[PDB]
Design a protein around this ligand. Structure first.
Ligand SMILES: NC(=O)c1ccc[n+]([C@@H]2O[C@H](COP(=O)([O-])OP(=O)(O)OC[C@H]3O[C@@H](n4cnc5c(N)ncnc54)[C@H](OP(=O)(O)O)[C@@H]3O)[C@@H](O)[C@H]2O)c1
Ligand SMILES: N[C@@H](CCC(=O)O)C(=O)O
Length: 277
């Protein structure tokens, strides 16, 4: 309530959260602060015209923030903790959402400033911007049960939220993390298809979106099972069972696994890459 928030990073995810946060009417635009290394017109400017405090000093951020968000590239993270760790007061919580980066790696490096640093690993996705972002997190060792709450509450406002035992976050990323992208991609395709049948762009694209959003809800709001809802919509006639057959023909599913995997495996590597060099 008297809580302030900051993003040492910036970019999309920052702006994204920034956005869904003020959106959630949970925080005040100006009650937010993020450091602008260089400033990426789009992102930064956006936030600026958004009403959030943007400073080139990812230090003032550190002070202004009752809760800290690490919104930088994974490889950047290091060059930060040891540039701000000296400013880590016992008040704020450090929420790192940089993918791949481990809690350990941070605690056990940020301890070299504060005896017991309070930190939690985070994982979300741009859709948070509206409020559908899918989030999951893990509590550090210096995790006092009142933070896992604030967190779970804070994020669970701009989306879905749930505790997760860190050793999952990597899989989780190649899913809820990247997933959106897969969608934006599938849609762009569908749209093309609708057009390849006459439908206009602005019309088709949008019909596809509305169909995805719809399928989403149904599956969530029921147990059923995807395969269930599958049969439940393909009349022995066709047009659908037929469209399926085609997708089915070209390993459509296979391609989705492949991507979850790719994304995951990649994340494994990114982190298991800065453990040394
Ligand atoms: N703060 C918010 O604004 C907020 C927060 C949450 C959700 N939503 C909103 O979310 C709505 C969609 O609610 P939702 O679909 O986002 O929440 P959600 O994705 O349904 O939360 C996630 C998963 O928990 C599943 N689940 C049930 N038993 C489980 C178990 N034993 N282990 C693990 N997972 C289990 C649910 O699916 P199943 O029911 O098929 O079991 C669900 O897919 C939208 O209508 C949007 O308005 C908004
Ligand atoms: N917290 C609720 C909100 C759902 C909604 O806003 O539709 C849930 O996750 O079900």
């Amino acid at each position: 309530r008297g809580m302030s928030v900051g993003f040492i990073g910036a970019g999309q995810l920052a702006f994204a959260l920034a956005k869904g946060f003020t959106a959630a009417g949970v925080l005040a635009a100006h009650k937010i602060m993020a450091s602008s290394p260089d400033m990426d017109l789009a992102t930064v400017s956006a936030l600026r015209k958004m009403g959030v405090k943007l400073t080139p000093h990812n230090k003032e951020t550190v002070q202004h923030s009752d809760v800290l968000f690490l919104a930088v590239k994974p490889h950047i993270i290091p060059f930060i903790l040891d540039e701000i760790g000296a400013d880590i007061e016992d008040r704020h919580i450090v929420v790192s959402c940089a993918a791949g980066v481990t809690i350990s790696s941070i605690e056990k490096k940020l301890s070299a400033f504060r005896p017991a640093p309070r930190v939690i690993r985070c994982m979300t996705n741009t859709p948070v911007v509206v409020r559908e972002g899918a989030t999951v997190y893990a509590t550090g060792t210096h995790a006092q049960v009142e933070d896992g709450r604030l967190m779970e509450q804070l994020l669970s406002s701009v989306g879905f939220c749930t505790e997760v035992e860190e050793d999952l976050i990597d899989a989780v990323t190649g899913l809820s993390g990247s997933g959106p992208a897969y969608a934006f991609t599938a849609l762009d395709a569908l749209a093309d298809g609708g057009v390849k049948m006459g439908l206009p762009r602005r019309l088709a694209v949008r019909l596809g979106a509305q169909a995805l959003l719809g399928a989403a809800k149904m599956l969530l709001h029921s147990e059923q099972h995807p395969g269930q809802l599958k049969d439940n919509v393909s009349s022995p006639g066709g047009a659908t069972i037929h469209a399926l057959h085609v997708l089915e023909s070209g390993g459509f599913r296979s391609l989705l696994i492949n991507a979850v995997e790719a994304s995951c495996i990649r994340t494994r590597e990114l982190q298991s890459m800065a453990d040394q060099e």
